[PDB]
Design a protein around this nucleic acid. Structure first.
Lengths: 76, 149, 144, 129
RNA sequence: CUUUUGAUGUUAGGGUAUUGGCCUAACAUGGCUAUGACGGGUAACGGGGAAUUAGAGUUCGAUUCCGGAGAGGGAGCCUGA
RNA sequence: ACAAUGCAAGGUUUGUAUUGGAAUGGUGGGAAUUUAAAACCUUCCCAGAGUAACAAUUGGAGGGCAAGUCUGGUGCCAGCAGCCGCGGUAAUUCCAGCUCCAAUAGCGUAUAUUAAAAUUGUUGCAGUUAAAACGCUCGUAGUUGAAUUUCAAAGAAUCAUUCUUUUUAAAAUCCGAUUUUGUUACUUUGAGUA
RNA sequence: AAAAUUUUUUGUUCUUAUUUUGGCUUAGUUACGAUUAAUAGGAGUAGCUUGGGGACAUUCGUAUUCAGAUGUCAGAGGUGAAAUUCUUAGAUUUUCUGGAGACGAACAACUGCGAAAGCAUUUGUCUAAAAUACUUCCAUUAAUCAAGAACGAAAGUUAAGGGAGUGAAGACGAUCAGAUACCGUCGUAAUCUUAACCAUAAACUAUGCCGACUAGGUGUUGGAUGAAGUGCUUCCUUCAGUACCUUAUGAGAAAUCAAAGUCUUUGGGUUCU
RNA sequence: UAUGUUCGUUA
């Protein structure tokens, strides 16, 4: 039964309805309280707005991010 | 895959949401100005979209504004006479020829140069079938080195 | 696909392919080469009239053991020398050394028949009298 | 290169039906394959099919009833006049009592019988039986 | 391949029953071709048709009718609508 | 062709050599007629059939392939045989007789051609090993090429379905109503077809 | 800017102008006007990504051999057994030094890369490719292709260089009835480098390329996602390779084949034979 | 892991 399949999320990309695995998130460095947007699977180096600090190193996937920070999904 | 083997289904899949993301409170009255500034500072549209996605958090320019980036870049007259991929293929062929004029024994480089020149000719035929290239465009292999412009 | 073009505008390719490839079977080539006219002695005729030059006993194949009676015939139409088998038991005696003879094919076109090698023709009548009416019974008049 | 979307659709239908899997997914949907499927439906050979209409020339999921022996495309789409319908039928269809040869005609996709009853033969699409 | 020896076209004329490189003068360099030009072979007059055909096909058509061509081989010409 | 006895089968039925009378052409002669004249055809009158001598042949009998392990002769010879094969003493295959089979006023043979032949394959072949994937890649002609632009509902009629009719955007014609809206392929009808 | 209408100066005829419309330039108004973004393609970006992909330079290793030295003294090589061969002028053997050319073991695999041929010591430079990840760009740019083109083992040819080892030819020694062979000793060309040719191999998975579908398991190579013993290490999912095993109410003449299947229920595209 | 050839034709 392929219409009401529910565990297509674990499926490979371009499943029954193709849908990107990436997303966007906001980052709050503790003691920094900065507001800026970040892309999952980011491809280049990125900096903060309030106080410049390295945030995530671009890798072949979801980046390494930092040892701290509170990062929250931007999904609605 | 045009040459060689390997399907390589790696790609980017757009979301079902064709509209601008709801969480984006930013306005399209200056996204095009941003890409215009990027192009003036000197960036090809392929990487303009990427730096827009990463450093500005505004994915799918087509969703933020109802128009695509090369289209609006043309609408401002910015777009170069030679398109993205044709220019990149020309640059790669030029680099290969420069390597080959020193290493005459690189048979593999010669084979790859033939392949990339074939791709150049196919793409050129397409682009001048569209009005996107003057009808006399030819890609002389002698003059390609400076043709990059 | 099936190894052949199938598109609705591939008729030329199919036609040239068939035209070239039909030269590959023996029958089409044999019946369509211009060689056949100058090759066979009958020049495409079913029968021919010749002059008997000599009579020869021809050895049969290995599995068999016989002396087939044949006649060397000079055709009067072109002058070629052929060898014609003489069917019948005593039919060799019924044909002398300088008679006009009528010959036909041996039934396998230009191929040899039976244990008799290199013979493609058979005598059907000598001195305008049928060998058949001469041998199997003397219903007809004797040799002239 | 897929060339014919309908050929893919029908080969997938036939393979799934041979396995008897009762439900099949055809990825590259099209209006032609939709009309073919609903003509098969009208003739009673498949059940309720449903098109998952995403933004990418969407997919189709059809319910099989174990009710089809062979569905196939005919490539190329030979243009057939009304006169040689019988000549095509006696060679393709397994009997002159059941099975349908699907025609694309100036009046839309239809089987041989109703194309004959409505005149105006057309181009051959495929068959199923 | 064709093009001096008309090949392709323009202009003018001659010629014709009439159009036309049909021919002449000048001029331009054209025209056809792998969708097979130019050649070679045909034991090739073409068609209506014939045989064999389940359907496709394959083979034949000198020969009743139609069209063409010829009167031993070429060429020329009178009369005449 | 037909009728009676013998013989065979069988519950006084069929086939079956003797008889012995009918019928009829082929044939000849005359005529009508036919025909430019004549001939043929058709029709009418005379004779005219019992071994109805008014006498059917051609090619076969190992298999393919219908029909002989019948009798003589020859004896790896002569010969037959499209192919497989037969022939050295028991030859079902040669040469003969008898018988039988086949088609029949027809029956063989040669060559060509069609089907057979899906062994030229569009329908519709094959390509690891039977013949057959170019050493490999690029590549022009050629062949082929993703999805997308206007979708349903209501009624009369056969039996339970099927079948026929109308509208529902927009722009130019008609004072709530009257009317045209790419090109081709393709397909349908025609026209004109000795 | 012109036409249609009218009136009209004016003794066979000479002004003119009036209103409506087809075309030029000018403020504003239209719902003013651009289909997706293909498990098609191409381009891009990213990764203490991958790889025996290629070229050039450079480095190392023993072995073999040459030369020199070294110590000793009768044999040493080689074979089925021998002999040819070397050997008191010291062979073989031991140790050391220097040179030379070739090769690159063991690791090394039903592993990796490459279009195929093919590619394996280090390091550097140059160059290319592929996979993966991508809410990056273009938007049909594609598939297969007669002609044509690039590359194409080995051998072979040409010209320089190189020349250790092996060694088509050749010469011996054997074996044998013979032995021009197989075996042994030697040995020319060749093998290696550079620059040109040649264009062929059982150049083979004897299986053209692209696309779709059809099944389980064991692996393994390269990415990516998620999860956990100790920042480290394993498992899960997934993509792309690459094999193997089982199964076929799939195929086939069978051997066999996950393609050689989805073929008399015969047609996805295409080239060659 | 020394050497060790040949068997007329037909049925």
């Amino acid at each position: 039964n392929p219409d009401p399949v529910e565990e297509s999320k674990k499926h490979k990309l371009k499943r029954l309805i193709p849908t990107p695995n990436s997303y966007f998130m906001d980052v709050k460095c503790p003691g920094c309280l900065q507001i800026t947007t970040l892309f999952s699977h980011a491809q280049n180096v990125v900096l903060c707005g309030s106080c410049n600090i390295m945030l995530c190193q671009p890798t072949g996937g979801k980046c390494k991010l930092t040892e701290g920070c509170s990062f929250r999904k931007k999904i609605e | 895959r045009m040459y060689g083997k390997g399907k390589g289904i790696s790609s980017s899949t757009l979301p079902y949401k064709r509209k601008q993301p709801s969480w984006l409170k930013q306005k399209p009255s200056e996204i095009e100005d941003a890409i215009i500034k990027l192009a003036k500072k000197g960036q090809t549209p392929s990487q303009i979209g990427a730096t827009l996605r990463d450093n500005y958090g505004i994915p799918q320019v087509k969703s933020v504004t109802g128009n695509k980036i090369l289209r609006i870049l043309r609408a401002q007259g910015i777009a170069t006479t030679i398109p993205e991929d044709l220019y990149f293929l020309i640059k790669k062929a030029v680099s290969m020829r420069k390597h080959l004029e020193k290493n005459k024994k690189d048979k593999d480089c010669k084979f790859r140069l033939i392949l990339t020149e074939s791709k150049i000719h196919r793409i050129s035929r397409y682009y001048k079938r569209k009005k996107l290239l003057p009808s006399n465009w030819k890609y002389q292999s002698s003059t390609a080195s400076a043709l990059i412009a | 696909g099936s190894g052949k073009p199938s598109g609705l505008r591939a008729a030329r390719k199919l036609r040239i392919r068939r035209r070239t490839q039909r030269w590959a079977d023996k029958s089409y080539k044999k019946s369509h080469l211009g060689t056949r006219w100058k090759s066979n002695p009958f020049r495409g005729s079913s029968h021919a009239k010749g002059i008997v030059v000599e009579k020869v006993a021809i050895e049969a194949k290995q599995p068999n053991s016989a002396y087939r009676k044949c006649v060397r015939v000079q055709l009067i139409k072109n002058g070629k020398k052929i060898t014609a088998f003489v069917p019948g038991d005593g039919c060799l005696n019924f044909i002398d050394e300088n008679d006009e003879v009528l010959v036909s094919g041996f039934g396998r076109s230009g191929h040899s028949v039976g244990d008799l090698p290199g013979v493609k023709f058979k005598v059907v009548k000598v001195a305008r009298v049928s060998l058949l009416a001469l041998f199997k019974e003397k219903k007809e008049k004797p040799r002239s | 290169v897929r060339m014919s979307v309908l050929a893919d659709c029908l080969k997938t239908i036939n393979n799934a039906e041979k396995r008897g899997r009762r439900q099949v997914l055809i990825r590259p949907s099209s209006k032609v394959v939709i009309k073919f499927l609903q003509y098969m439906q009208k003739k009673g050979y498949i059940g309720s099919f449903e098109i998952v209409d995403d933004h990418r020339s969407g997919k189709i999921v059809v319910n099989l009833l174990g009710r089809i022996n062979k569905c196939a495309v005919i490539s190329p789409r030979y243009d057939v006049k009304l006169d040689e319908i019988e000549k095509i039928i006696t060679s393709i269809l397994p009997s002159r009592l059941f099975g349908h040869l699907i025609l694309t005609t100036p009046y839309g996709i239809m089987d041989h019988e109703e194309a004959r009853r409505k005149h105006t033969g057309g181009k051959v699409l495929g068959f199923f039986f």
